[PDB]
Design goal:
It is classed as isomerase. The protein is mostly beta strands. It has one domain: Chitinase A, domain 3. The protein has two helices and seven strands, in the order H-E-E-E-E-E-H-E-E. Strands 1, 2, 3, 4, 5, 6 and 7 form a seven-stranded antiparallel beta sheet that branches. The chain is globular and about 35 Å long.
């Protein structure tokens, strides 16, 4: 499924080139700009464990998730991945534990050393 597709096909967007955050663009955005670090970003997401099991989606609550880009308010993979996105873009990210919840995980939903999948839509972004 999607998580296995990005493991097999995803672009490595670390920095360290450690395959810790892999990306596929699924829908191309409509703007040419990404958000800048510090920008307020508004996203919809659907998260799955590596094996396809859904753990959460903002669409259920019909409530965009908001954060300040690149400020450590969310797991590392999101700060890195959302920074690569254009407004209106939908991407898939696959995130190794080092760029997510690590050895502790976030039980009950997320086990230790979990590689997580996200489908993320960048709805909007605003200045700092």
């Amino acid at each position: 499924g999607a998580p296995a597709t990005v493991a097999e096909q995803g672009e490595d967007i670390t920095s360290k080139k450690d395959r810790g955050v892999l990306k596929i663009v699924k829908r191309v955005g409509n703007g040419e700009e990404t958000p800048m670090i510090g920008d307020k970003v508004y996203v919809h997401y659907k998260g799955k464990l590596s094996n396809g099991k859904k753990f959460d989606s903002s669409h259920d609550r019909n409530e965009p998730f908001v954060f300040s880009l690149g400020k450590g308010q969310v797991i590392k993979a999101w700060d890195i991945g959302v920074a690569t996105m254009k407004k209106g873009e939908i991407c898939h990210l696959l995130c190794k534990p080092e760029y997510a919840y690590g050895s502790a995980g976030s039980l009950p939903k997320i086990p230790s050393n979990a590689t997580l999948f996200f489908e993320i839509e960048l709805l909007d972004f605003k200045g700092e």
